[PDB]
Design a protein around this ligand. Structure first.
Ligand code: HEM
Length: 110
């Protein structure tokens, strides 16, 4: 099975390396990037992201709901376009299918 947990870890590394300030919105604010894997708040968040990916592939993802929750944290289209790029890099690094269509689905509600 595609190692989505590893893809997601690389995704967050790319995302926070390019936009360190995005990390301030999470429960692992301030934590060194090389230590995220040892952080409980991060472990939970990464698990939810992996779940969302498996839901998008499986056909049950609620893109509208995910978009609305992100708007609820003041996260919008710009951030998601940046995330789309970071996730494409993470997928490519693992020879995983690209998730651009799934991100476009979320973007369609932002
Ligand atoms: C690849 C794109 C992204 C995906 C698939 C994704 C997925 C998720 C999921 C599944 C959750 C949990 C949702 C829930 O509350 O039920 C979440 C929460 C959150 N996301 Fe995203 N996200 C993405 C990009 C971003 C970006 C770019 C930001 C910018 C800061 C962000 C900020 C947040 C924040 C602040 C939370 C709430 C965390 C908390 O409750 O402590 N996300 N995300």
């Amino acid at each position: 099975m595609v190692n989505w947990a590893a893809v997601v870890d690389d995704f967050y590394q790319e995302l926070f390396k390019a936009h360190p300030e995005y990390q301030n919105k999470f429960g692992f604010k301030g934590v060194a990037l090389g230590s995220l894997k040892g952080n409980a708040a991060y472990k939970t968040q990464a698990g939810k992201t992996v779940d969302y990916i498996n839901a998008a592939i499986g056909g049950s993802a609620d893109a509208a709901g995910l978009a609305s929750r992100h708007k609820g944290r003041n996260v919008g289209s710009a951030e998601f376009h940046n995330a789309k790029a970071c996730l494409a890099k993470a997928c490519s690094a693992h020879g995983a299918p690209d998730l651009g269509h799934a991100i476009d689905d979320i973007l369609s509600h932002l």
